[PDB]
Design an enzyme around this catalytic site. Structure first.
Site, PDB file in Angstrom:
ATOM      1  N   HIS A  42      17.384  54.550 -52.349  1.00 26.28           N
ATOM      2  CA  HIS A  42      18.063  54.427 -51.302  1.00 26.28           C
ATOM      3  C   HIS A  42      17.965  52.999 -50.711  1.00 26.28           C
ATOM      4  O   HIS A  42      18.506  52.458 -49.792  1.00 26.28           O
ATOM      5  CB  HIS A  42      17.300  55.104 -49.861  1.00 26.28           C
ATOM      6  CG  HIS A  42      16.137  54.800 -49.386  1.00 26.28           C
ATOM      7  ND1 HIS A  42      14.981  55.393 -49.480  1.00 26.28           N
ATOM      8  CD2 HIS A  42      15.836  53.629 -48.428  1.00 26.28           C
ATOM      9  CE1 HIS A  42      14.045  54.606 -48.936  1.00 26.28           C
ATOM     10  NE2 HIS A  42      14.594  53.779 -48.285  1.00 26.28           N
ATOM     11  N   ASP A  88      15.120  60.122 -54.931  1.00 29.78           N
ATOM     12  CA  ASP A  88      14.988  58.874 -54.300  1.00 29.78           C
ATOM     13  C   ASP A  88      14.107  58.115 -55.193  1.00 29.78           C
ATOM     14  O   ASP A  88      13.239  57.568 -54.958  1.00 29.78           O
ATOM     15  CB  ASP A  88      13.952  58.798 -53.008  1.00 29.78           C
ATOM     16  CG  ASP A  88      14.569  57.632 -52.155  1.00 29.78           C
ATOM     17  OD1 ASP A  88      15.144  56.551 -52.395  1.00 29.78           O
ATOM     18  OD2 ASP A  88      13.954  57.656 -51.030  1.00 29.78           O
ATOM     19  N   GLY A 179      10.922  49.409 -44.807  1.00 32.61           N
ATOM     20  CA  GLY A 179      10.684  48.157 -45.383  1.00 32.61           C
ATOM     21  C   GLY A 179       9.569  48.496 -46.678  1.00 32.61           C
ATOM     22  O   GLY A 179       9.493  47.687 -47.517  1.00 32.61           O
ATOM     23  N   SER A 181       9.709  51.191 -48.428  1.00 34.72           N
ATOM     24  CA  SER A 181      10.289  52.134 -49.273  1.00 34.72           C
ATOM     25  C   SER A 181      10.325  51.375 -50.737  1.00 34.72           C
ATOM     26  O   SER A 181      10.537  50.414 -50.898  1.00 34.72           O
ATOM     27  CB  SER A 181      11.882  52.216 -49.080  1.00 34.72           C
ATOM     28  OG  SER A 181      11.713  53.167 -47.745  1.00 34.72           O
ATOM     29  N   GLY A 182       9.907  52.541 -51.823  1.00 33.77           N
ATOM     30  CA  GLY A 182       9.881  51.833 -53.143  1.00 33.77           C
ATOM     31  C   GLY A 182       8.354  51.507 -53.390  1.00 33.77           C
ATOM     32  O   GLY A 182       8.323  51.426 -54.909  1.00 33.77           O
TER      33      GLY A 182
HETATM   34  C1  LIG Z   1      13.938  52.499 -47.187  1.00 30.58           C
HETATM   35  C2  LIG Z   1      12.380  52.837 -46.673  1.00 30.58           C
HETATM   36  O1  LIG Z   1      12.053  51.591 -46.321  1.00 30.58           O
HETATM   37  C3  LIG Z   1      12.352  54.056 -45.547  1.00 30.58           C
HETATM   38  C4  LIG Z   1      10.549  54.169 -45.512  1.00 30.58           C
HETATM   39  C5  LIG Z   1      10.429  54.890 -44.214  1.00 30.58           C
HETATM   40  C6  LIG Z   1       8.947  55.615 -44.399  1.00 30.58           C
HETATM   41  N1  LIG Z   1       8.603  56.193 -43.132  1.00 30.58           N
HETATM   42  C7  LIG Z   1       7.444  56.941 -43.099  1.00 30.58           C
HETATM   43  N2  LIG Z   1       7.138  57.595 -41.936  1.00 30.58           N
HETATM   44  N3  LIG Z   1       6.486  57.115 -44.172  1.00 30.58           N
HETATM   45  N4  LIG Z   1      13.006  55.044 -45.872  1.00 30.58           N
HETATM   46  C8  LIG Z   1      13.944  55.331 -45.051  1.00 30.58           C
HETATM   47  O2  LIG Z   1      14.058  54.537 -43.996  1.00 30.58           O
HETATM   48  C9  LIG Z   1      14.652  56.608 -45.304  1.00 30.58           C
HETATM   49  C10 LIG Z   1      16.106  56.184 -45.947  1.00 30.58           C
HETATM   50  C11 LIG Z   1      17.101  56.118 -44.655  1.00 30.58           C
HETATM   51  C12 LIG Z   1      16.609  57.300 -44.068  1.00 30.58           C
HETATM   52  N5  LIG Z   1      15.235  57.250 -44.261  1.00 30.58           N
HETATM   53  C13 LIG Z   1      14.446  57.663 -43.340  1.00 30.58           C
HETATM   54  O3  LIG Z   1      13.068  57.760 -43.359  1.00 30.58           O
HETATM   55  C14 LIG Z   1      14.809  58.593 -41.965  1.00 30.58           C
HETATM   56  N6  LIG Z   1      14.180  58.161 -40.729  1.00 30.58           N
HETATM   57  C15 LIG Z   1      14.879  60.270 -42.064  1.00 30.58           C
HETATM   58  C16 LIG Z   1      15.554  61.032 -41.152  1.00 30.58           C
HETATM   59  C17 LIG Z   1      14.800  61.755 -40.597  1.00 30.58           C
HETATM   60  C18 LIG Z   1      15.307  62.690 -39.596  1.00 30.58           C
HETATM   61  C19 LIG Z   1      17.113  62.684 -39.696  1.00 30.58           C
HETATM   62  C20 LIG Z   1      17.684  61.796 -40.514  1.00 30.58           C
HETATM   63  C21 LIG Z   1      16.817  60.928 -41.330  1.00 30.58           C
END
Ligand SMILES: *C[C@@](*)(O)[C@H](CCCNC(N)=[NH2+])NC(=O)[C@@H]1CCCN1C(=O)[C@H](N)Cc1ccccc1
Ligand SMILES: *C[C@@](*)(O)[C@H](CCCNC(N)=[NH2+])NC(=O)[C@@H]1CCCN1C(=O)[C@H](N)Cc1ccccc1
Lengths: 228, 228
Positions: A42, A88, A179, A181-182
């Site tokens: 992602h 992912d 931020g 992620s990965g």
């Molecule tokens: C891309 C990464 O930086 C990020 C990591 C988030 C980690 N969060 C926690 N609590 N550890 N991931 C994201 O942003 C991912 C990919 C895009 C959507 N997403 C989400 O985390 C959404 N907030 C999940 C979601 C929940 C409910 C409805 C729709 C989406």
């Protein structure tokens, strides 16, 4: 990372950072070898062009600094879909190999699935605020236990696949965030996860959801060999 | 295929056809196994949605007919670029496995590079006209020799990579053409090529250029194993 601490020098040698056109960090990564970096699929659509940064500026303990690498080939898991955020995971191939040192080394792939209760180390340059935007000047670290699949599934009804696992605290306050992620999730010396998604950040009963690297060992190994 | 002949019954059991939304054929393919089909990467952007058709309607020799399959996963070689058309290769994963029979069977991957002068069988449902559009009602077949790399490079100065080889006639008149891309090039029982590109069709001193499958045996094998 929310509610973490400034990683100690040389604590996360395998950490990588993806930077966009504006030289800003938008996602993490894990060094797997001299040419390969593991990250989240992602993150690939969160920026047009990007490079990878590894290393650190703490020359006191070891010289070398930070190194920015260009990405030659991007290999996203073809089964990834933002409908579920399953699969992912992505592998990056650098144009030039990374020069390893004691503070810049690859992570170990897992040889066994993650065990409940096990302590893991999560790191990243992502948001440190539950609500609002507060990014760190230093790499953040967080120690968190692996949660039972039952509690994970109970946290995200019907949204947890076999390729996902939860790590964090049900009471909230400490979790990865945007931020990160990965980024790596290392438990007892093994790479068990990749930061993936969650409902908000550090919310109560909403623990971070991670890509279960153990289920992708075959895909990673063969994908690297297919392109090597 | 230009200047070919109507393939004889059961002559190309490994032939596959990619069909678009309008149920029209736009590219060829080669059956590798029950779930995998080999085709050209450039065919992937010549249509939004597509399915794969294998088999034939010649029930006299064998019953079974034609079978249309849905594509579950599309795995394009990440190094492909239309700037050179190098790495013009892709692997498709079907939702349902193909039911093999004597007239519907997989092709054999190569165990040795193609030898100059060797006769090969090229097949496809593509254009049969040098200039203009004349598509066939029956699968077309063409027997053509493998050309020396020297003559190939001489035909397309600086545009021939190590992953490409020429098959055809320097005098023109017989060659593959539009719509045949992805199709098989079988020499002495082995899959040696995938129809890729060329300057026009059946033009003098402009032989068809094919993807050298032998150079991709490792990529195909590991990619299939990474996704299996
Ligand atoms: C891309 C990464 O930086 C990020 C990591 C988030 C980690 N969060 C926690 N609590 N550890 N991931 C994201 O942003 C991912 C990919 C895009 C959507 N997403 C989400 O985390 C959404 N907030 C999940 C979601 C929940 C409910 C409805 C729709 C989406
Ligand atoms: C997608 C396939 O059906 C088709 C096969 C053509 C085979 N031709 C011969 N003579 N055996 N391939 C193509 O259409 C490819 C991909 C897109 C461009 N292309 C070409 O063959 C171009 N005509 C090549 C070209 C030559 C000069 C300048 C630009 C492109």
């Amino acid at each position: 990372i929310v509610g973490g601490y400034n990683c100690k020098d040389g604590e996360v040698p395998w950490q990588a950072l993806l930077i966009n056109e504006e030289n800003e960090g938008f996602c993490g990564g894990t060094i797997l070898s001299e040419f390969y970096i593991l990250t989240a699929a992602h993150c690939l659509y969160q920026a047009k062009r990007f490079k990878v940064r590894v290393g650190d500026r703490n020359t006191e303990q070891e010289e070398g600094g930070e190194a920015v690498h260009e990405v030659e080939v991007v290999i996203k898991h073809n089964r990834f879909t933002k409908e579920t955020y399953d699969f992912d995971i992505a592998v990056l191939r650098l144009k030039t190999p990374i020069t390893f040192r004691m503070n810049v080394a690859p992570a170990s792939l897992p040889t066994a699935p993650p065990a409940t209760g096990t302590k893991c180390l999560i790191s990243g340059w992502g948001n440190t605020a539950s609500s609002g935007a507060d990014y760190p000047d230093e790499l953040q670290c967080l120690d968190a236990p692996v949660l039972s699949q039952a509690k994970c599934e109970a946290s995200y009804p019907g949204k947890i696949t076999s390729n996902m696992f939860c790590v964090g605290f049900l009471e909230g306050g400490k979790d990865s965030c945007q931020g990160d992620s990965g980024g790596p999730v290392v438990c007892n010396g093994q790479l068990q996860g990749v930061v993936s998604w969650g409902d908000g950040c550090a919310q109560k009963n909403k623990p971070g959801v991670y890509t279960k690297v153990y289920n992708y060992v075959k895909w990673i190994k063969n994908t690297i060999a297919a392109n090597s």
